[PDB]
Amino acid sequence: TKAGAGFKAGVKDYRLTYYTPDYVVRDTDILAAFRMTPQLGVPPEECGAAVAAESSTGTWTTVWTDGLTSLDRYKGRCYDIEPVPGEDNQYIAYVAYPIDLFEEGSVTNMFTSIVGNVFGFKALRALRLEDLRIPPAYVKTFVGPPHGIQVERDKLNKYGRGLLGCTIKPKLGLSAKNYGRAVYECLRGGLDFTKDDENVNSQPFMRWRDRFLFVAEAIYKAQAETGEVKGHYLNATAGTCEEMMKRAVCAKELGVPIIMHDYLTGGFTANTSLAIYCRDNGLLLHIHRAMHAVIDRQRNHGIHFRVLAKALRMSGGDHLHSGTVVGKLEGEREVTLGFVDLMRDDYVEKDRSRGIYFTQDWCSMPGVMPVASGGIHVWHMPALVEIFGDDACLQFGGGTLGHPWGNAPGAAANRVALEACTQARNEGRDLAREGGDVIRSACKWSPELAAACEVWKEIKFEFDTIDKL
Amino acid sequence: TKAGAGFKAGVKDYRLTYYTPDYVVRDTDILAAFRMTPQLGVPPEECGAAVAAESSTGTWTTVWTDGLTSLDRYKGRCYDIEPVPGEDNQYIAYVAYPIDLFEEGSVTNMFTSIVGNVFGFKALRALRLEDLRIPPAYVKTFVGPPHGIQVERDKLNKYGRGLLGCTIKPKLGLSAKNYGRAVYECLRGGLDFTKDDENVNSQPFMRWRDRFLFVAEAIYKAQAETGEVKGHYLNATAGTCEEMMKRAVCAKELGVPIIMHDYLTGGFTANTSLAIYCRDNGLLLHIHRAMHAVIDRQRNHGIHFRVLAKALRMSGGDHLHSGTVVGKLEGEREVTLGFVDLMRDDYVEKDRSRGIYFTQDWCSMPGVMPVASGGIHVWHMPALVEIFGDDACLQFGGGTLGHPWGNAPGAAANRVALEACTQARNEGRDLAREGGDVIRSACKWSPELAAACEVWKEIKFEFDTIDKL
Amino acid sequence: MSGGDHLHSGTVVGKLEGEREVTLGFVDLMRDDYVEKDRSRGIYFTQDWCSMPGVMPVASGGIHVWHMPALVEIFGDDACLQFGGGTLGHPWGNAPGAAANRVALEACTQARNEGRDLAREGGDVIRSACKWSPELAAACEVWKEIKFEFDTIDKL
Amino acid sequence: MMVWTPVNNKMFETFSYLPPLTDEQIAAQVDYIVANGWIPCLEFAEADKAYVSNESAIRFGSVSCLYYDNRYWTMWKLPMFGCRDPMQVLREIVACTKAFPDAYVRLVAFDNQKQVQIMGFLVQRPKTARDF
Amino acid sequence: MMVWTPVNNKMFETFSYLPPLTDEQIAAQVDYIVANGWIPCLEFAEADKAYVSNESAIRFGSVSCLYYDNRYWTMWKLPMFGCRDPMQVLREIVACTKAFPDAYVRLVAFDNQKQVQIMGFLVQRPKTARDF
D60–E62 C-beta distance less than 8 A: no
Smallest Cα distance from D75 to chain C, Å: 10
D115–A159 C-beta distance less than 8 A: no
Separation in Å, CA B366 to CA A275, B323, B338, B362: 36, 21, 17, 10
Cis peptide before A166 (omega within 30 of 0): no
- Catalytic residue of the set A155, A169, A246, A301: A169
Contacts of B53 (CB under 8 A, 6+ apart): B14, B17, B18, B59, B76
* Contact E18/C at CB under 8 A: yes
- φ/ψ of residue C94, rounded to 5: -65, -40
The chains in contact with chain B, meaning 3 or more Cβ pairs closer than 8 Å, are A
DSSP letters for E73-111:
-EEEEEE--S---HHHHHHHHHHHHHH-TTEEEEEEEEE
Instruction: Tell me which residues of chain A, numbers 410 to 469, contact chain D at a CB-CB cutoff of 8 Å.
Output: 412, 415-416, 419-420, 422-423, 426-428, 442, 447-448, 451
Residue A179's nearest CA partner among A232, A225, A228 is A232
Question: SS3 letters for chain A?
Answer: CCCCCCCCCCCCCHHHCCECCCCCCCCCCEEEEEEEEECCCCCHHHHHHHHHHHHHCCCCCCCHHHHHCCCCCCCCEECCCEECCCCCCCEEEEEEECHHHCCCCCHHHHHHHHHHCCCCCCCEEEEEEEEEECCHHHHCCCCCCCCCHHHHHHHCCCCCCCEEEEECCCCCCCCHHHHHHHHHHHHHHCCCEEECCHHHHCCCCCCHHHHHHHHHHHHHHHHHCCCCCCEEECCCCCCCHHHHHHHHHHHHCCCCCCEEECHHHHEHHHHHHHHHHHHHCCCCEEECCCCCCCCCCCCCCCCCHHHHHHHHHHHCCCEEECCCCCCCCCCCHHHHHHHHHHHHCCCCCCCHHHCCCCCCCCCCCCCCEEEECCCCCHHHHHHHHHHHCCCCEEEECCCCCCCCCCHHHHHHHHHHHHHHHHHHHHCCCCHHHHHHHHHHHHCCCCHHHHHHHHHCCCCCCCCCCCCCC
Burial bucket for residue E61 (CB in 10 Å: 0-12, 13-18, 19+)? exposed
User: Is B403 part of the annotated catalytic residue set?
Assistant: no
Q: Are D54 and D68 in contact (CB under 8 A)?
A: yes
Which long-range CB contacts under 8 A does D72-76 form with residues at least 24 apart? Answer: D72/D45, D73/D43, D73/D44, D73/D45, D73/D106, D73/D108, D74/D43, D74/D44, D74/D45, D74/E5, D75/C93, D75/D41, D75/D42, D75/D43, D76/D42, D76/D43, D76/D44, D76/D105
Q: Quick one: closest CA in B to A141, which residue? A: B239
Smallest Cα distance from D109 to chain A, Å: 9
Q: What is the residue type of A259?
A: I
Chains B and E touch, using 3 or more CB pairs below 8 Å: no
Which helix H or strand E contains B269, and what residues bound it?
helix B268-280
Specify which residues B369 forms β-bridges with: B319
Q: How far apart are CA A37 and CA A45, in angstroms?
A: 11
Binding residue numbers of B for substrate: 117, 167, 171, 289, 321, 373
C92–D75 C-beta distance less than 8 A: no
What is the Cα A401 distance to its own chain's centre? 26
Q: What is the residue type of E85?
A: D
Cis peptide before B204 (omega within 30 of 0): no
Smallest Cα distance from D78 to chain C, Å: 7
Number of C-beta neighbours around residue A5 at 10 A: 13
Chain A residues with beta carbon closer than 8 angstroms to that of B451: none
Burial bucket for residue A245 (CB in 10 Å: 0-12, 13-18, 19+)? middle
Identify the DSSP state of B149.
H
C8 is in an annotated binding site: yes
Q: How far apart are CA C62 and CA C11, in angstroms?
A: 6
Of A158, A254, A442, nearest to D119 by CB-CB distance is A158
- Within 13 Å of residue B423, how many CA atoms lie on the same side as its CB? 10
- Catalytic residue of the set A288, A310, A319, A380: A288
- What kind of experiment solved this structure? cryo-EM
Torsion over CA of B202, B204, B210 and B211, rounded to 10 degrees?
-40
Smallest Cα distance from E107 to chain C, Å: 14
Chain A residues with beta carbon closer than 8 angstroms to that of D16: 228
Q: For testing the chain C interface, which of D41, D44, D74, D77 should be mutated: the one with the most C CBs within 10 Å?
A: D77
Identify the DSSP state of B14.
G
Torsion over CA of B293, B297, B301 and B306, rounded to 10 degrees?
140
Q: What is the residue type of D58?
A: I
Q: Which residues precede chain breaks (C–N over 2.5 Å) in chain A? A: none
Q: How far apart are CA A179 and CA D53, in angstroms?
A: 25
D114–A419 C-beta distance less than 8 A: no
Contacts of B289 (CB under 8 A, 6+ apart): B264, B308, B312, B320, B321, B322, B329
Chain D residues with beta carbon closer than 8 angstroms to that of A153: 114, 116-117
Q: Can you tell me whether residue B247 is helix, strand or coil?
A: helix
Q: How far apart are CA A235 and CA E6, in angstroms?
A: 47
Residue B59's nearest CA partner among C91, A211, A399, C80 is A399
Identify the DSSP state of B7.
P
- Within 13 Å of residue D24, how many CA atoms lie on the same side as its CB? 0
Which helix H or strand E contains B82, and what residues bound it?
strand B82-83
Of D13, D29, D63, nearest to A158 by CB-CB distance is D13
Specify which residues B242 forms β-bridges with: none
Exposure string for B363-373, b = 16+ CB within 10 A, e = fewer:
eebbbbbbbbb
Identify the DSSP state of B115.
I
Q: Are B186 and B408 in contact (CB under 8 A)?
A: yes
Which helix H or strand E contains E39, and what residues bound it?
strand E39-46
Q: Quick one: closest CA in B to A55, which residue? A: B171
Resolution (A): 8.1
* Contact C30/E at CB under 8 A: no
Exposure string for A352-391, b = 16+ CB within 10 A, e = fewer:
eeebbbbebeeeebbbbbbbbbbbbbbbbbbbbbbbbebb
Helical pair B381-388 and B407-426, crossing angle rounded to 10 deg: 50
Torsion over CA of B149, B155, B157 and B158, rounded to 10 degrees?
-10
Q: How far apart are CA A222 and CA A229, in angstroms?
A: 9
Q: How far apart are CA C72 and CA A111, in angstroms?
A: 66
Residue A265's nearest CA partner among A288, A244, A295 is A288
Specify which residues E107 forms β-bridges with: E42
E63–D61 C-beta distance less than 8 A: yes
Q: Are A397 and A374 in contact (CB under 8 A)?
A: yes
Contacts of A192 (CB under 8 A, 6+ apart): A163, A164, A165, A229, A230, A231
Chain A residues with beta carbon closer than 8 angstroms to that of D4: 189, 408-409, 412, 448
Residue A305's nearest CA partner among A468, A140, A464 is A468
Q: Are E94 and E105 in contact (CB under 8 A)?
A: no
Q: How far apart are CA A58 and CA C56, in angstroms?
A: 67
Chain C residues with beta carbon closer than 8 angstroms to that of E18: 103, 106-107, 110
* Contact D18/A at CB under 8 A: yes
Exposure string for B173-188, b = 16+ CB within 10 A, e = fewer:
bbbbeebbbbbbbbbb
Chain D residues with beta carbon closer than 8 angstroms to that of A160: 14, 108-109, 118-120
Burial bucket for residue B140 (CB in 10 Å: 0-12, 13-18, 19+)? middle
Chain C residues with beta carbon closer than 8 angstroms to that of D77: 92-93
Q: Can you tell me whether residue C56 is helix, strand or coil?
A: strand
Q: How far apart are CA A200 and CA A194, in angstroms?
A: 12
Torsion over CA of B192, B193, B194 and B196, rounded to 10 degrees?
180
Q: For testing the chain D interface, which of E64, E66, E69, E70 should be mutated: the one with the most D CBs within 10 Å?
A: E64
Chain D residues with beta carbon closer than 8 angstroms to that of E58: 58
Separation in Å, CA A197 to CA A203, A216, A256, A410, B117: 12, 18, 18, 20, 10
C54–E32 C-beta distance less than 8 A: no
Chain D residues with beta carbon closer than 8 angstroms to that of E64: 59-61
Q: How far apart are CA B225 and CA B218, in angstroms?
A: 10
> C-alpha angle A50/A52/A57, rounded to 5°?
90
User: Is A261 part of the annotated catalytic residue set?
Assistant: no
* Contact C116/E at CB under 8 A: no
A159–D4 C-beta distance less than 8 A: no
Separation in Å, CA D91 to CA A139, D27, D88, D94, D95: 50, 12, 5, 5, 6
- φ/ψ of residue E92, rounded to 5: -65, -40
Separation in Å, CA B133 to CA A173, B54, B115: 22, 19, 14
Q: How far apart are CA B215 and CA B257, in angstroms?
A: 12
A327–B121 C-beta distance less than 8 A: yes
Q: How far apart are CA C113 and CA C111, in angstroms?
A: 5
* Contact C93/E at CB under 8 A: yes
Which helix H or strand E contains D97, and what residues bound it?
helix D86-99
Q: How far apart are CA E32 and CA E27, in angstroms?
A: 9
Q: How far apart are CA B467 and CA B297, in angstroms?
A: 10
Q: Are C61 and C83 in contact (CB under 8 A)?
A: yes
Q: How far apart are CA A424 and CA B188, in angstroms?
A: 80
Contacts of D113 (CB under 8 A, 6+ apart): none
What is the Cα A231 distance to its own chain's centre? 22
Of E1, E55, E63, nearest to D60 by CB-CB distance is E63
E29–C113 C-beta distance less than 8 A: yes
Chain D residues with beta carbon closer than 8 angstroms to that of E5: 74, 99-100
The chains in contact with chain D, meaning 3 or more Cβ pairs closer than 8 Å, are A, C, E
E114–C114 C-beta distance less than 8 A: no
Identify the DSSP state of E22.
P
Residue B134's nearest CA partner among B350, B296, B337 is B350
A241–B270 C-beta distance less than 8 A: yes
Residue C1's nearest CA partner among C53, C59, C56, C58 is C53
Q: Quick one: closest CA in E to C116, which residue? A: E32
Q: Are E105 and E124 in contact (CB under 8 A)?
A: yes
- Within 13 Å of residue D43, how many CA atoms lie on the same side as its CB? 21
DSSP letters for C100-136:
HHHHHHHHHHHHHHTT--HHHHHHHHHHHHTTS-HHH
Q: What is the residue type of B111?
A: F
Separation in Å, CA C155 to CA B186, C16, C23, C27, C75: 74, 11, 12, 18, 20
Residue D97's nearest CA partner among D125, D70, D118 is D125
Identify the DSSP state of B312.
H
Residue B343's nearest CA partner among B322, B328, B325, B327 is B322
Q: How far apart are CA C136 and CA C129, in angstroms?
A: 7
* Contact D17/A at CB under 8 A: yes
Q: Are A321 and A288 in contact (CB under 8 A)?
A: yes
- Within 13 Å of residue B7, how many CA atoms lie on the same side as its CB? 25
Separation in Å, CA B9 to CA A51, A411, A444, B364: 55, 16, 22, 50
Q: How far apart are CA B16 and CA A469, in angstroms?
A: 30
3-state percent breakdown (helix, strand, coil) of chain D, nearest 5? 25, 25, 55
Smallest Cα distance from A381 to chain D, Å: 17
Separation in Å, CA B12 to CA B17, B50, B60, B62, D63: 7, 11, 11, 8, 46
D15–A150 C-beta distance less than 8 A: no
- φ/ψ of residue A302, rounded to 5: -175, -115
Contacts of B166 (CB under 8 A, 6+ apart): B186, B191, B194, B195, B374, B395, B396, B397, B399, B400, B401, B411, B414
